[PDB]
């Protein structure tokens, strides 16, 4: 299949709402392509930038990681946070494994163990809000698979009871989707950004477009 094909170039949008023609012509202001070290250096030089991660050609290369977004407008203590996050990760891993077995035809056990092996988490500087993005490094699939799965995720969110499981946004599974780069300003006049976590210290582990099978 892909084999040698492993994504390492980072395609980035420097402004929300990019005009279509400028994207087609590869404008140097709203569209750019860096490497991991290049992107890190660019972020370091300009802390006021606003960058969004997205794919460029979905008809040629269509391999990505699994990414999810959670946003809930309430703060909570530590122990409850850990209990809720472990319950949520167990539930979502089970749901994805069941979908993979039922439709994709893969192996439930391998999928669930790969999903539960390694996962990346973020945090928000907001005091009264809890939002994060979860990216699974050891799981790979195409965009249309996630688009199909969005229904199962929506019913999972509606049926469940855990506060963050109710806060899963299924709208991100859309054609020409975008994701904000961690540690980058969302608005030009907004100081709310995403902070890092002790388990991982590399940007490579927090990008869903990075494809490197092991």
């Amino acid at each position: 299949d892909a084999a040698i094909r492993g994504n390492d170039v980072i395609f980035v949008l420097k402004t929300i709402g990019v005009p279509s023609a400028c994207r087609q012509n590869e404008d140097p202001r709203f569209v750019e392509a860096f490497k991991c070290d290049e992107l890190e250096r660019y972020i370091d030089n300009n802390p006021e930038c606003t960058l969004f991660e997205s794919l460029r050609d979905e008809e040629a290369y269509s391999i990505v990681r699994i990414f999810m977004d959670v946003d809930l407008d309430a703060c909570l203590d530590e122990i409850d946070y850990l209990t809720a996050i472990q319950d949520f990760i167990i539930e979502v891993s089970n749901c994805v494994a069941r979908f993979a077995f039922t439709e994709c035809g893969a192996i439930h056990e391998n999928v669930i163990k790969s999903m539960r092996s390694n996962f990346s988490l973020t945090k928000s500087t907001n005091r009264d809000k809890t939002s994060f993005h979860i990216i699974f490094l050891d799981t790979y699939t195409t965009m249309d698979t996630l688009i199909a799965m969005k229904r199962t995720l929506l019913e999972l969110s509606r049926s469940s009871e855990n506060p963050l499981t109710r806060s899963i946004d299924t709208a991100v599974y859309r054609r020409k989707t975008t994701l904000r780069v961690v540690g980058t300003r969302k608005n030009p006049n907004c100081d709310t950004i995403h902070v890092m976590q002790p388990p991982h210290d590399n940007i490579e582990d927090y990008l869903f477009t990075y494809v490197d099978m092991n």
Partner: protein, 546 residues
């Protein structure tokens, strides 16, 4: 969406204390007006005492969130769902984990105690629910405690299953009570990893890694016993190799196309090997009667074939002598039928007429085997292993040494026995079997016939070597056959019957060859005219260009 009254009832039951702002709540401003709780008792969310601030309700994602104004850490957040049967959600969650499946045979298989349990008259679904209770969030265990709710969840699970899945598709896996052993590398899976391969059978005993060790005194004793039964000499090198191959083939779950004969005079240790194998693989070993080799299978029920299903080793012992009176010759059709991937047979009070064949069939005998009809098809579906080592009491030491059957006599030791029935060499034998399987069968597993033995076959083996079929290519030497005296009447090298018997008499002694000679006569009988009893054959020994 549900009626507003039901939501108000739920939110009023969640708050143990009453609400003094009950009347002012309406369908248009239920998310704007703060509500006042009379604090005579601590609130349900957080105990504390007499919260000094009111609460508020918000609607999002079809759910009602309760939050207290002020410091967020003072009170806990509560979420009220809109609709959705809780039992249905629990059933979906349980079905998600792939712990229960439906097979092609119309039965349900569950996964508990690291084993694929399977029954047709028991409610294994309820046991699975009760066991899996722990993995679910704590708000579901209380519901799962009641039996009626368990029955409802089981009904939902039954309604949610529509497809069938194949079972036992891996021929190189050995299932145990607490895991699956991989015959390729010899490393033993456990826990969930064994659930990947759907194996509905098991050896019946748990697997222990402590005794699965190459070096142990029990291993040395087993090696000594094996050497005593089968010496490692140059003569029986092929015999010992065939013995090892046949023993190792009992682990593979594929289909075997040969039958092995354990031929030996008496007290040669065949029962010892059978009991060791039984102690090794457990219940995958099944002993059956001789009826299959003597009767037909289609008519009436046949519970033996029903029990043969999916077994990996079948043993038929104590073969009666066919030389004596009342003999029933072995049915060649049964032999040809027993080497097929599917065997047709019906159980008692049933309709299934197909069974999977994964069994290595081993027949223990004391005398020579006798069949009714012999053909080339039978010669490719038979094999034999010769057992020549006596184990006798020194009281009959000389009584056995004079015998020409036994080749080496040893002391009959009253040891073993119970120890073998005590599984003293259970795990020791598995290591040797796995080693032999790696030595022989890993690239391609396939058995091979041994037509050279079974002297009843020998005549039929000789004729093909001795006789050749006349054809047009024997025309250019019509002089040579004219030397023999044959004729080209009907454009074929004829052979008078008188000439044929006078020819074969000087090379074959007939009598015991007479019956099969006559069978050859009638089977290949050709009458060109009323009285020209010619044959379509050429003797290669004397008509090798004479």
């Amino acid at each position: 969406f549900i009626s507003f009254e039901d939501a108000i009832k739920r939110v009023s039951k969640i708050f143990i204390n009453s609400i003094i702002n009950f009347n002012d709540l309406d369908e248009n401003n239920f998310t704007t007006v703060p509500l006042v709780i009379d604090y005579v008792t601590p609130c349900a969310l957080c105990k504390k005492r007499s919260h000094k601030h009111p609460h508020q309700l918000s609607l999002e994602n079809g759910a009602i969130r309760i939050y207290k104004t002020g410091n967020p850490h003072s009170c806990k957040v509560k979420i009220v769902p809109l609709d959705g049967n809780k039992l249905f959600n629990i059933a979906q969650r349980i079905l998600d984990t792939n712990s229960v499946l439906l097979t092609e045979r119309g039965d349900h298989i569950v996964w508990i105690n690291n084993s694929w349990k399977f029954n047709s008259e028991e409610p294994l679904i309820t046991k699975l629910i009760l066991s899996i209770r722990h993995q679910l969030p704590k708000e579901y265990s209380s519901e799962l405690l009641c039996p009626r709710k368990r029955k409802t969840v089981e009904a939902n699970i039954r309604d949610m299953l529509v497809d069938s899945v194949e079972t036992d598709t891996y021929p190189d896996k050995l299932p145990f009570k607490n895991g699956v052993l991989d015959l390729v590398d010899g490393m033993f899976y456990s826990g969930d990893d064994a659930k990947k391969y759907t194996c509905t059978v098991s050896t019946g005993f748990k697997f222990d890694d402590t005794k699965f060790v190459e070096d142990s005194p029990e291993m040395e004793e087993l090696m000594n016993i094996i050497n005593d039964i089968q010496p490692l000499t140059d003569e029986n090198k092929k015999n010992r190799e065939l013995y090892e191959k046949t023993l190792s083939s009992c682990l593979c779950g594929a289909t075997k196309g040969c039958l092995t004969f354990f031929f030996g005079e008496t007290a040669t240790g065949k029962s010892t090997t059978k009991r060791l194998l039984k102690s090794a693989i457990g219940d995958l070993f099944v002993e059956t009667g001789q009826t299959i080799l003597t009767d037909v299978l289609d008519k009436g029920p046949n519970p033996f074939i029903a029990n043969m299903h999916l077994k990996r080793s079948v043993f038929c012992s104590e073969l009666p002598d066919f030389a004596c009176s009342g003999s029933k010759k072995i049915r060649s059709d049964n032999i040809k039928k027993l080497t097929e991937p599917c065997v047709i047979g019906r159980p008692c009070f049933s309709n299934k007429i197909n069974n999977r064949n994964h069994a290595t069939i081993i027949i223990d005998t004391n005398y020579k085997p006798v069949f009714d009809r012999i053909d080339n098809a039978l010669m490719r579906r038979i094999a034999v292993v010769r057992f020549r080592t006596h184990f006798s009491q020194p009281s009959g030491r000389e009584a056995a040494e004079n015998n020409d059957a036994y080749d080496k006599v040893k002391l009959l030791d009253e040891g073993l026995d119970g120890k073998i029935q005590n599984n003293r060499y259970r795990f020791a034998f598995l290591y040797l079997l796995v080693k032999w399987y790696k030595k022989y069968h890993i690239p391609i597993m396939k058995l091979y016939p041994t037509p050279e033995e079974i002297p009843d076959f020998a005549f039929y083996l000789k004729i093909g070597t001795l006789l050749v079929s006349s054809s047009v290519k024997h025309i250019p030497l019509m002089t040579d056959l004219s030397k023999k005296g044959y004729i080209l009447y009907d454009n074929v090298v004829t052979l008078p019957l008188t000439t044929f018997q006078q020819k074969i008499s000087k090379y074959f002694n007939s009598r015991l060859f007479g019956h099969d000679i006559e069978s050859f006569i009638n089977r290949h009988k050709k009458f060109a005219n009323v009285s020209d009893e010619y044959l379509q054959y050429i003797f290669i020994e004397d008509i090798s260009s004479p």
